[PDB]
Amino acid sequence: RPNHTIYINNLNEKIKKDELKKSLHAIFSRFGQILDILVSRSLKMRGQAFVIFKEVSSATNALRSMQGFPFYDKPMRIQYAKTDSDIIAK
RNA sequence: GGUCACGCACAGAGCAAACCAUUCGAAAGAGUGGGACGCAAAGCCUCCGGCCUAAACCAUUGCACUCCGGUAGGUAGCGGGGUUAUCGAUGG
Numbered sequence: 400r401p402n403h404t405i406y407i408n409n410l411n412e413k414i415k416k417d418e419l420k421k422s423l424h425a426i427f428s429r430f431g432q433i434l435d436i437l438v439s440r441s442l443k444m445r446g447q448a449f450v451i452f453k454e455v456s457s458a459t460n461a462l463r464s465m466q467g468f469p470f471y472d473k474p475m476r477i478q479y480a481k482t483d484s485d486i487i488a489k
Numbered sequence: 490g491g492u493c494a495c496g497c498a499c500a501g502a503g504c505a506a507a508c509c510a511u512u513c514g515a516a517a518g519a520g521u522g523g524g525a526c527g528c529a530a531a532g533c534c535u536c537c538g539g540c541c542u543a544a545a546c547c548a549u550u551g552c553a554c555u556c557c558g559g560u561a562g563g564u565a566g567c568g569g570g571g572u573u574a575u576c577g578a579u580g581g
């Protein structure tokens with residue numbers, strides 16, 4: 400089940416697209432060298448964000464730590480992505 | 490000469506993009522002053538599509554890498570259409 404990418408949801412939708420990005424960068428670069436962190440507030444993909452890592456070990460490292468984490472007045476919910484990013488799917 | 494189309498001109502006259510100053514706005518943006526990229530309606534109207542915005546209100550717990558909720562504002566200089574209008578090539 401493990402993956403390069405981790406899926407977080409139940410985040411605060413009020414937070415700006417670009418603010419939410421830089422928010423997660425400093426808090427998750429604590430585990431690896433993040434490739435890219437795709438987020439949008441579009442109806443389907445709002446309140447949620449994907450974290451693409453260079454190492455899977457670093458993604459696993461980040462996962463088994465911060466589940467249920469209060470972050471911008473909201474519990475954070477980590478779980479691996481099922482299908483990788485187009486940057487990794489090759 | 491009207492009416493409706495057309496724009497290769499004359500001739501007069503009209504707005505005014507970027508930028509900057511300043512105010513209103515969360516923002517997109519708009520207003521005025523300066524400025525002139527262009528414009529045959531770059532006069533005006535959000536009715537049809539698109540794009541830009543997302544502060545609040547309701548909507549949503551959602552696995553993306555075409556994008557994509559409502560609502561609301563914006564854009565007429567994004568097209569579409571409605572309406573008003575100037576010149577008049579021995580002009581069609």
Ligand SMILES: Nc1nc2c(ncn2[C@@H]2O[C@@H]3COP(=O)(O)O[C@H]4[C@@H](O)[C@H](n5cnc6c(=O)[nH]c(N)nc65)O[C@@H]4COP(=O)(O)O[C@H]3[C@H]2O)c(=O)[nH]1
Nearest residue numbers: 496497498499501502503504527528529530531575576577
């Ligand atoms: N009086 C009058 N003359 C017309 C008309 N249509 C064409 N012309 C003449 O033919 C030229 C070509 O017009 P254009 O290709 O649309 O190209 C034009 C046009 O796109 C624009 N322009 C100039 N004046 C105006 C205006 O008052 N309103 C608008 N919307 N555009 C203008 O600048 C360009 C060159 O300027 P011009 O010296 O006017 O150059 C014009 C003008 O001399 C019209 O409806 N009325």
Ligand SMILES: [Mg+2]
Nearest residue numbers: 499500501502
């Ligand atoms: Mg002229």
Ligand SMILES: [Mg+2]
Nearest residue numbers: 534535563565
């Ligand atoms: Mg208007």
